[PDB]
Amino acid sequence: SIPSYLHADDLGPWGNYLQQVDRVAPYLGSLSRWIETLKRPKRILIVDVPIELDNGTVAHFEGYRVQHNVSRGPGKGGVRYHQDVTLSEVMALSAWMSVKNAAVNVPYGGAKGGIRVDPRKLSRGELERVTRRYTSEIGIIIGPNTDIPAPDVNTNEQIMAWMMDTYSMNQGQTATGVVTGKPISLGGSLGRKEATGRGVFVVGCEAAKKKGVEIEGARIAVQGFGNVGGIAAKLFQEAGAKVIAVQDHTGTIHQPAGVDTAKLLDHVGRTGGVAGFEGAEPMPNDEFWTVETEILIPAALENQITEKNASKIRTKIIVEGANGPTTTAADDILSANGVLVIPDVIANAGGVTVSYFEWVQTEDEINHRLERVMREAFAGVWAVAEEHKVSVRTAAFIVACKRILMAREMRGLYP
Amino acid sequence: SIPSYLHADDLGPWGNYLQQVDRVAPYLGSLSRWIETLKRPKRILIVDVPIELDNGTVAHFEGYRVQHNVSRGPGKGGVRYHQDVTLSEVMALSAWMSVKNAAVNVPYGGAKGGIRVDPRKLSRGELERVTRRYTSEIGIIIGPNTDIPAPDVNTNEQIMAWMMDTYSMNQGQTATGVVTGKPISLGGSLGRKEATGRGVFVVGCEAAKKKGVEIEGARIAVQGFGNVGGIAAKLFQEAGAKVIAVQDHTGTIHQPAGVDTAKLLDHVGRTGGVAGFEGAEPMPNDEFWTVETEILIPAALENQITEKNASKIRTKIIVEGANGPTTTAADDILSANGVLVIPDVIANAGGVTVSYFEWVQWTEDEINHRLERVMREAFAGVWAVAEEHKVSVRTAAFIVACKRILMAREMRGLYP
Amino acid sequence: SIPSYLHADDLGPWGNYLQQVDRVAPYLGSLSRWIETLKRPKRILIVDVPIELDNGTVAHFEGYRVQHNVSRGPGKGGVRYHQDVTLSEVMALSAWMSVKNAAVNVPYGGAKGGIRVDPRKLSRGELERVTRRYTSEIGIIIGPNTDIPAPDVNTNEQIMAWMMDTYSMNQGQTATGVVTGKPISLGGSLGRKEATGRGVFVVGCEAAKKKGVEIEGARIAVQGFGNVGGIAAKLFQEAGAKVIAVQDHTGTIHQPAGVDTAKLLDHVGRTGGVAGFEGAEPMPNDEFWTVETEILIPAALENQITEKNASKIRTKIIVEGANGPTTTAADDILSANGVLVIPDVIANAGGVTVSYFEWVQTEDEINHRLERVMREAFAGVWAVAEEHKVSVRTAAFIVACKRILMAREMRGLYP
Amino acid sequence: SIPSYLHADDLGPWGNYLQQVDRVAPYLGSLSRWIETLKRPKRILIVDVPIELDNGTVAHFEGYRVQHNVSRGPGKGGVRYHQDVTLSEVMALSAWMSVKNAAVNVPYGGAKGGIRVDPRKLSRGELERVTRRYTSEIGIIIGPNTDIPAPDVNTNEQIMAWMMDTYSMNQGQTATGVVTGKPISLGGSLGRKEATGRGVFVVGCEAAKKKGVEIEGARIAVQGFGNVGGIAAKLFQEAGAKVIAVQDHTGTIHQPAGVDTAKLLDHVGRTGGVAGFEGAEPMPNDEFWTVETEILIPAALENQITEKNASKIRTKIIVEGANGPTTTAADDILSANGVLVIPDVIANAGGVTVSYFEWVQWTEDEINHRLERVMREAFAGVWAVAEEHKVSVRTAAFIVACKRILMAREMRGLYP
Numbered sequence A, C: 001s002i003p004s005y006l007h008a009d010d011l012g013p014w015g016n017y018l019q020q021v022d023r024v025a026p027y028l029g030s031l032s033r034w035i036e037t038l039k040r041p042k043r044i045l046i047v048d049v050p051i052e053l054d055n056g057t058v059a060h061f062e063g064y065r066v067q068h069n070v071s072r073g074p075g076k077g078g079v080r081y082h083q084d085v086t087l088s089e090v091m092a093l094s095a096w097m098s099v100k101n102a103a104v105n106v107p108y109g110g111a112k113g114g115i116r117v118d119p120r121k122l123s124r125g126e127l128e129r130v131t132r133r134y135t136s137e138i139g140i141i142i143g144p145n146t147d148i149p150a151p152d153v154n155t156n157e158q159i160m161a162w163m164m165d166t167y168s169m170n171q172g173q174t175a176t177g178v179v180t181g182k183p184i185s186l187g188g189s190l191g192r193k194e195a196t197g198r199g200v201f202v203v204g205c206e207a208a209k210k211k212g213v214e215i216e217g218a219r220i221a222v223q224g225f226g227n228v229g230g231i232a233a234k235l236f237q238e239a240g241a242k243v244i245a246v247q248d249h250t251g252t253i254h255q256p257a258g259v260d261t262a263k264l265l266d267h268v269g270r271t272g273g274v275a276g277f278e279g280a281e282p283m284p285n286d287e288f289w290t291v292e293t294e295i296l297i298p299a300a301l302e303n304q305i306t307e308k309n310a311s312k313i314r315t316k317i318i319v320e321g322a323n324g325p326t327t328t329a330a331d332d333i334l335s336a337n338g339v340l341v342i343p344d345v346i347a348n349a350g351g352v353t354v355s356y357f358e359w360v361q362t363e364d365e366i367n368h369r370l371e372r373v374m375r376e377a378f379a380g381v382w383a384v385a386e387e388h389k390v391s392v393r394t395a396a397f398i399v400a401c402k403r404i405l406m407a408r409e410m411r412g413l414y415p
Numbered sequence B, D: 001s002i003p004s005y006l007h008a009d010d011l012g013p014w015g016n017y018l019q020q021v022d023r024v025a026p027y028l029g030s031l032s033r034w035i036e037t038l039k040r041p042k043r044i045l046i047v048d049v050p051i052e053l054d055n056g057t058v059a060h061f062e063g064y065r066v067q068h069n070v071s072r073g074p075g076k077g078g079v080r081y082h083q084d085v086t087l088s089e090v091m092a093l094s095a096w097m098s099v100k101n102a103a104v105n106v107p108y109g110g111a112k113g114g115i116r117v118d119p120r121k122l123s124r125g126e127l128e129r130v131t132r133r134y135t136s137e138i139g140i141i142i143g144p145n146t147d148i149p150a151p152d153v154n155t156n157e158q159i160m161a162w163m164m165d166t167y168s169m170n171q172g173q174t175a176t177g178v179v180t181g182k183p184i185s186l187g188g189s190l191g192r193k194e195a196t197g198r199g200v201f202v203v204g205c206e207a208a209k210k211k212g213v214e215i216e217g218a219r220i221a222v223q224g225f226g227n228v229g230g231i232a233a234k235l236f237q238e239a240g241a242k243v244i245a246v247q248d249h250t251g252t253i254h255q256p257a258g259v260d261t262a263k264l265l266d267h268v269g270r271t272g273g274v275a276g277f278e279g280a281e282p283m284p285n286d287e288f289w290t291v292e293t294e295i296l297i298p299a300a301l302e303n304q305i306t307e308k309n310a311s312k313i314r315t316k317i318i319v320e321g322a323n324g325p326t327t328t329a330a331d332d333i334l335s336a337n338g339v340l341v342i343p344d345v346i347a348n349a350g351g352v353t354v355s356y357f358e359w360v361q362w363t364e365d366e367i368n369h370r371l372e373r374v375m376r377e378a379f380a381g382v383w384a385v386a387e388e389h390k391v392s393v394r395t396a397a398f399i400v401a402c403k404r405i406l407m408a409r410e411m412r413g414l415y416p
């Protein structure tokens, strides 16, 4: 049964997560007794985030920090700034953290934050004030040893610096370990910046090996061209693939010869989106999903590959950079159509893997260890998929949830 | 706008509270720029409360602690165990705490807790385990100097004792100030246990003087016969009133000679409700609202006097012991019909008043004498404001309370 | 069943305390279920207290803090420095604290401290160093809101000042509420210094009314002439009584005319004890107990009125200033001889009552409220004794233990 | 002088420890002035552990946590559940932790915990409640940076999980570092679980080299077949040795061909002990000590090799898996009989060594490979000391450890 604070016909991403839980249920053996633990976050914190606007009036924004499961260790997970941030969305994101963390076996529980705001509508000062007030409000449950935030959509090294500074001033001492994804002047690295994109690239290459797809001249489509999508695209072109189609919030472009990802990155950084890129042609947004490719990389927001457009997708491999881009109804259609789907909770875990590295701590040393971690987790999940004759997503959930509920099992209930 | 985590077609009591806020808006003056602070709780904590049931299976209950506003001091407010506990309801209850605390001028912010559970369905052990797990889950935001819980619907000295012990054991030291409503053996009193009901009685008498109603012979109806309703009814009969009708969750009883509250209290204690009481007749639940009285006392749950039944009410004074029992639509109808309505946020504040006396530390009589006097003073103050602005006592109570709460916000400012 | 860390043949005062608990068991009713709580201290802390001696060598002393029961509130109770301090003794003293605190109804659990040292064998420097090391070592379980020490045998305002300072310096801030019995300069009072003796005097007068003993001309004998004994004798002489026999660790003196208590106080202060006092005749220690009196006040150490000498006693009232001066075998003998015995756990509760007054914070007003509390506590216990046909001691335990165990019952067990 | 809270005629294991300290006294040099530090634990905490039994009765158990010496670092040491747990035993166990941690040079002081309880007499629910109440009571002095418990007799990864969870719920955050010996799901390893038994095997092979004893074909007798005894016997059989006699609390078995340790471990798991094992013959308990072996491994409880049975032992090497299994009087007898005794404070330090590894953040084989190396090197260092002073390995081990502990005490000094 769903919690009374949610509406059953308005479950958003959390409704998808719950479907993914139902699908792993038959594979949990005696851990089944504990399955409801997956459907109930330990801690939901909803905080008022009031600031004085530049125009003189007071503005109130919804801030969230959800700790979904911390059986295995302190909470870990990013912070989203987006106009569509909601309780149900932050809950789902915190759950996929719990599952991805268990799946790649980092000693972290899952947590997530969000502010319901479009940062484009705020001045730089307003953005800073919102960030600091939010960090003050959630300070009561975060900390280097308790719950460690990180970037997500519309947040970045600057937002993390403001968070780290605010928490430090509040507490009275510099605490670099309270957030990851920090600027290098404060402890972070170019390693962490490209970690998520690089993980996506690595597991996409491992899947291509399985699917018999050659990376040289492989057609790639990417949704999103920010921290995850932009980096994944850069690495695939550098591997000799052709990134032939990109869609973001500003529109869609198309380049049969493959875009110059370097120039497109600079263009995205200069205008805020791919629309207007000189080295490509504009394309209707719907046509993006029908462009024939070898690999499709959803790396924008959730619920993008759905019952509605899944059948018209013509690709060999989907590699989920985004959290929850694909629904379970879509999974079924894509499988029936012979598409290999590499799940978010495996594919995008590069970020939290290096976040772990940053929390504990060449650039090549880091990356080579990450690539090892990502291949090994992929290898393991693949073996579980083969063993139980299930999709890679289900297999990922088998591995992650067995680790989560065994922790619950051993820890027990008090009292 | 309303927060995105609520639905507009499902606001519960929070919707009623927002309407009450709209009505104080014209009276805030320069503090109007802060009015949205009243519509946004500072802190919403929702916790999982898992236990193993006696039967071997794991059960998960919804737990809540909402700190609506702490501009003026630490959080203060009860914990409700009820099957219809929801986010919006605990939100509304915590907001009424902020207002009532500012109205009677105790240095507490408003907070409230809830567990979505029917205690009737739980064994005594299960109820303990639920209470302890809840307490350990919200431990991170409560404490004797931070947020202090107390009883509410279906909770009592035993539930409070369990919360206090749990918190103490988690913290590693006895912390008797972490909750109020404690049993005598842990720092509480019979004073606090009858405080809210006594506050209702005192305030109802002050109102009766204003409307020219004599207490001796006066007909009283009471919805709810628990901690608040039972004591209120008991005190009114002892003052010479006739409690002629009682409704609770088990049924409605009617007795024009006035019930023996001593015997009815005992009956509710043995059986669980007023249903089946010897000294009365059973009456249809809807009919309860139509019984002619001098004073009607809703002391059960919220949203009980509505546009559906407000025109049918025949009484001179409503004194709200319950939180949120009357909607703003009902207010308009009752006022049109010349009914005097004394708002919850004044009438039921006797509890948090003596809760303050428990937390901060004189005979019981002396303690009651100060309580009675505190309630009289706050009533007279709110009444003076009602006359000043020619508004209802509810609006005046909000004028007084929100001016205190928002001036605190104004002075504290925003950081950064 | 006694704990394994004690020896049955070597129980010391704990053995007497256990017999007292057995004597209250028939009167607990439904609270009998919890009676073992009285028999088991929540917390025993034994600490090494090493210092460097003046002679250049290292000395190790035994330090103790026992928290017997904290159901009703934070621990409260004094610290004894004495060569015969032992685990069993500190346990017993902490348990009498719990009981007296509930009998007089202050919101404190029972606790006690001790250092097995004879201060007469230490220089002032050494005594200070021992006091400070001991405070640092037990720091982890004491504090203004947790456990509040106080004086007892061979400790006083100077020991308390050192304890308070050490704790403040360890914690980084002045914390005056960490102990009671402080010097005036640090928050304390003459009211607290005389509180225990005054309580003994008050209660003694209430018993005298019950037994028809006139204070005017009454013969008083006091064992111990320290903080408790000295002050009680002083108040009784001021009330017109004759203090005719005093015994302390240095000897016994006798003065049928009644000693000048003021001069004897001065003499003890200068020489260390009553021995050699000019205004009295020396007398064998054993003969002390046979001197006929109206009121006998044991205000020294425990186990002083026993099966061996109880039959020899010729007095009308015994008022216990000391903790546990009278064994249960002695109670029975005394009972049979028509001697009224007013128990320690009522008679000496003046200290903790004004200690409470100190912990929360005129002198005449402060004493006027000490006297009212003591009379009301005495009348209440007297009522219970008559109601149940039991001794005053048993009645005091009835009142105290019903309050202690009802707090236990209500708090329950977690888990 | 012994502390007044102990009896000279009832010192238990603590008395044996003191004899051991006396034997190292001539070798301390200038650090002699601090010898009494070895004989006085910094901190003894004894706690009441009340629970409600399944039959409705309140039961009180004795809980202990003794922090013997923390000059060199945070406290580290196991928790024993046993019916003969006593103050003197937990003191002795804490002190051997101090010594072994210094001997193998891990940055931990010595501590130990226990509950005087026979787990066989409690249900699983009762055992859990005891564990949790104990953890909440000793919480005030344990923590990941303060004092980190671990397994010992009758405790294990399930007990560790419960301690960890309790401490985390009390503190309000997951704290996986508060204990070691955790299950894999909570951060523990198979390396840690086999660690002590493995270190016993490693040093046993290091002594076998010194004595020219071939592991292949060597006769082994083990007392105790739990976490230490079981894994040690397995590792020896896998190295070609024959495990010919096993004694545990249920009895003694004999098998001159060498037991299948895999099948015996399974039997012990299923029935609780070695009694009834089909693959061997029953044998009188006292005869266990007279069986001729190459290697004898006491891996049960203390005081098993004494004046009484020492002259009867026919073996080449004794390797102490247990804490304090051998008295000083037995030591002398064994030395005169040419038996080589490898002491507990070196031989069983494998656990704390990997406990350190767990607490701090390589495959399971690299973990083991590092364990093997540190154990060989610590053995070789103590051996060099023993030959330097012409003393036993036990005395040499104390020389190494006590010099390090007392130098730490010397530098830190006394405050004030």
Ligand SMILES: NC(=O)c1ccc[n+]([C@@H]2O[C@H](COP(=O)([O-])OP(=O)(O)OC[C@H]3O[C@@H](n4cnc5c(N)ncnc54)[C@H](O)[C@@H]3O)[C@@H](O)[C@H]2O)c1
Residues within 6 Å of the ligand: A078, A151, A152, A153, A154, A155, A196, A223, A224, A225, A226, A227, A228, A229, A247, A248, A249, A250, A273, A299, A300, A301, A302, A321, A322, A323, A348, A349, A351, A352
């Ligand atoms: N370390 C990380 O940053 C990390 C780790 C794991 C998963 N993720 C997930 O990866 C995804 C992207 O994260 P980011 O860090 O790249 O965000 P980012 O803010 O750098 O860029 C976000 C991208 O999403 C696109 N987008 C937004 N709304 C869109 C719409 N309606 N239609 C199409 N595209 C739209 C934007 O145009 C932009 O390209 C999110 O799902 C995030 O949760 C991020």
Ligand SMILES: NC(=O)c1ccc[n+]([C@@H]2O[C@H](COP(=O)([O-])OP(=O)(O)OC[C@H]3O[C@@H](n4cnc5c(N)ncnc54)[C@H](O)[C@@H]3O)[C@@H](O)[C@H]2O)c1
Residues within 6 Å of the ligand: B078, B151, B152, B153, B154, B155, B196, B223, B224, B225, B226, B227, B228, B229, B247, B248, B249, B250, B273, B299, B300, B301, B302, B321, B322, B323, B348, B349, B351, B352
């Ligand atoms: N100190 C306090 O307990 C306190 C303080 C201030 C306000 N209040 C308010 O007073 C009211 C009652 O508090 P309590 O402490 O009396 O609770 P209580 O649990 O002692 O009893 C509650 C009463 O409500 C009645 N009730 C429940 N459902 C009903 C229904 N559907 N129809 C009619 N009656 C119904 C129950 O039968 C019972 O008589 C609540 O609104 C509570 O918020 C209580």
Ligand SMILES: NC(=O)c1ccc[n+]([C@@H]2O[C@H](COP(=O)([O-])OP(=O)(O)OC[C@H]3O[C@@H](n4cnc5c(N)ncnc54)[C@H](O)[C@@H]3O)[C@@H](O)[C@H]2O)c1
Residues within 6 Å of the ligand: C078, C151, C152, C153, C154, C155, C196, C223, C224, C225, C226, C227, C228, C229, C247, C248, C249, C250, C273, C299, C300, C301, C302, C321, C322, C323, C348, C349, C351, C352
């Ligand atoms: N606030 C308090 O100080 C307080 C409160 C309650 C109870 N008590 C009890 O009162 C008693 C005395 O307390 P104090 O504070 O007066 O101690 P104190 O150290 O001021 O004087 C103690 C007295 O005991 C005497 N004494 C010691 N050994 C003796 C022996 N073998 N024979 C005879 N006399 C001996 C000493 O000579 C001295 O007169 C103790 O039992 C203490 O626990 C003290």
Ligand SMILES: NC(=O)c1ccc[n+]([C@@H]2O[C@H](COP(=O)([O-])OP(=O)(O)OC[C@H]3O[C@@H](n4cnc5c(N)ncnc54)[C@H](O)[C@@H]3O)[C@@H](O)[C@H]2O)c1
Residues within 6 Å of the ligand: D078, D151, D152, D153, D154, D155, D196, D223, D224, D225, D226, D227, D228, D229, D247, D248, D249, D250, D273, D299, D300, D301, D302, D321, D322, D323, D348, D349, D351
């Ligand atoms: N990591 C560890 O577990 C660890 C580390 C270092 C030292 N030790 C020591 O090793 C010994 C056991 O460790 P464990 O972890 O194996 O305990 P365990 O509880 O797994 O098994 C204990 C063994 O002792 C046996 N035993 C109990 N009483 C006995 C008796 N009277 N006669 C003969 N055998 C008896 C039991 O039958 C069982 O075989 C203890 O001395 C413990 O302190 C354990």
Ligand SMILES: O=C(O)CCC(=O)C(=O)O
Residues within 6 Å of the ligand: A076, A077, A078, A079, A097, A148, A149, A150, A151, A152, A180, A323, A348, A349, A351, A352, A353, A355
């Ligand atoms: O780096 C992290 O902590 C994880 C970032 C995140 O939220 C994600 O993996 O989606």
Ligand SMILES: O=C(O)CCC(=O)C(=O)O
Residues within 6 Å of the ligand: B076, B077, B078, B079, B148, B149, B150, B151, B152, B180, B323, B348, B349, B351, B352, B353, B355
């Ligand atoms: O006494 C308190 O602190 C809270 C009482 C309460 O919950 C209420 O006033 O409704």
Ligand SMILES: O=C(O)CCC(=O)C(=O)O
Residues within 6 Å of the ligand: C076, C077, C078, C079, C148, C149, C150, C151, C152, C180, C323, C348, C349, C351, C352, C353, C355
């Ligand atoms: O003042 C106190 O806290 C108690 C003094 C004391 O030790 C006693 O009452 O015996």
Ligand SMILES: O=C(O)CCC(=O)C(=O)O
Residues within 6 Å of the ligand: D076, D077, D078, D079, D097, D148, D149, D150, D151, D152, D180, D323, D348, D349, D351, D352, D355
């Ligand atoms: O793992 C540890 O901390 C040590 C276990 C223990 O108590 C021992 O070595 O005997």
